[PDB]
């Protein structure tokens, strides 16, 4: 799809067997989701944003489907105010910014 | 241009006669720049993201160039960790997300 930016670019994702709404975020290095369980090991991480830092759990090799498109990568889980799909997974679905 | 996301989408901007680096951010409603002087009156605004909220100064109808494309619009100034070009100005330069 071509998605305009008149409104927030939200899409449906499937992760951990759950459907969620997430923001396609070209200004995010990483993919950050609100609290949920994910299988496998994890390790703690601090990430920054406008606002400062939050502590998250880092899960590697997590499969996600973004608006129809399968990918695999690291997913961070923690107290984010918005679910975001960051560049680590946007690349895998071939997303580009065009102007 | 077409910008892939393997690296941060950093571009040069021109504001107040000076060149700066900024991040194209589809997850940002607004445009937020590090402390600088801008002409005219400002108004108060609070902006939130991962981390919490910060106070910023809102300047309207500021001339800004983004990767060479001319825009005129609202610029927020404050203690952001990074210069961010958000959807208010990405829509002015005709940017879309594509996959």
């Amino acid at each position: 799809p071509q998605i305009t930016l008149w409104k927030r670019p939200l899409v449906t994702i499937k992760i951990g067997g759950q459907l969620k709404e997430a923001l396609l975020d070209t200004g995010a290095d990483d993919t950050v989701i609100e609290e949920m369980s994910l299988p496998g090991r994890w390790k703690p991480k601090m990430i920054g944003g406008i606002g400062g830092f939050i502590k998250v759990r880092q899960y590697d090799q997590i499969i996600i489907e973004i608006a129809g498109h399968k990918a695999i990568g690291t997913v961070l889980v923690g107290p984010t105010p918005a679910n975001i799909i960051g560049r680590n997974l946007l690349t895998q679905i071939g997303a580009t910014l065009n102007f | 241009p077409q910008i892939t996301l393997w690296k941060r989408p950093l571009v040069t901007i021109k504001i107040g006669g000076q060149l700066k680096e900024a991040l194209l951010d589809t997850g940002a409603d607004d445009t937020v720049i590090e402390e600088m002087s801008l002409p005219g009156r400002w108004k108060p605004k609070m902006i939130g993201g991962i981390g919490g909220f910060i106070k910023v100064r809102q300047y309207d109808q500021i001339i800004i160039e983004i990767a060479g494309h001319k825009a005129i619009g609202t610029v927020l100034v404050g203690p952001t960790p990074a210069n961010i070009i958000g959807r208010n100005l990405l829509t002015q330069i005709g940017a879309t997300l594509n996959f």
Partner: peptide, 10 residues
């Protein structure tokens, strides 16, 4: 030094 900028007006 993962940085992640969602942003909205509070």
């Amino acid at each position: 030094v993962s940085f992640n900028x969602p942003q909205i007006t509070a």
